[PDB]
Design a protein around this ligand. Sequence first.
Ligand SMILES: CC(=O)Nc1nnc(S(N)(=O)=O)s1
Ligand SMILES: [Zn+2]
Ligand SMILES: [Zn+2]
Length: 257
Amino acid sequence: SHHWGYGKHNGPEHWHKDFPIAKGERQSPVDIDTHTAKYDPSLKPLSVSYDQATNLRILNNGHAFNVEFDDSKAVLKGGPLDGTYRLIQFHFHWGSLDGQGSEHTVDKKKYAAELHLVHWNTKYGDFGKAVQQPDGLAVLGIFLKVGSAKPGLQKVVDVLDSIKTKGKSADFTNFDPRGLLPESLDYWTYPGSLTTPPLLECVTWIVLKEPISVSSEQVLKFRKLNFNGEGEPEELMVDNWRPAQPLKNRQIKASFK
Ligand SMILES: CC(=O)Nc1nnc(S(N)(=O)=O)s1
Ligand SMILES: [Zn+2]
Ligand SMILES: [Zn+2]
């Protein structure tokens, strides 16, 4: 298949052929330069209102694994946002044993991995309408570094063996994303895009300053996933990140001095 991916023949340098907005003015990720990302006082503290979700789904879509929220609850408000944004899913980007694998960088420094909690603006009635609008999505990005285990990640890691290959999905119940947050909600924000096709410029990025620590054993489980489908040759799911994109006219703002 010539479906997009992260390989030599289908990776980020190819994406613009099917998705011309890849070369747009508000593409993500970007490098966050601490000397030019200015403190903005128009910015409020973030309001992250999460709790245990009952019915979820975990799946390997050949690009990452998603944990999807199916309850008909978890919302993000405040910070740079107007209105209420509902959590729909989260997923990660990561590197190999030999490399870093965040999407955003800070002063050109990459973190081991990056968590994306994807939220859509409830004003729009559904996700498909939301992605068509500049205020449609809010993605809360959280860096991962390797250290001690993140207890609230363990339930996710424990079920990754069951979705090893592309197309596998599984029922997943009783998960609280509060367990994925760092202590501080200090953040940077800027207007940007989905970091994967369709690369739509519909995202308010909120990137937390404080990384979470995960164990090498936890991230190892990420790296044992496969890009390929069952029965095909093994291609380990690693380095599923897009390179940093030009800031162009944008300003990155900081919630903190
Ligand atoms: C359905 C959905 O959430 N699609 C996404 N595609 N890219 C995303 S990202 N990396 O910008 O968080 S989210
Ligand atoms: Zn796809
Ligand atoms: Zn992502």
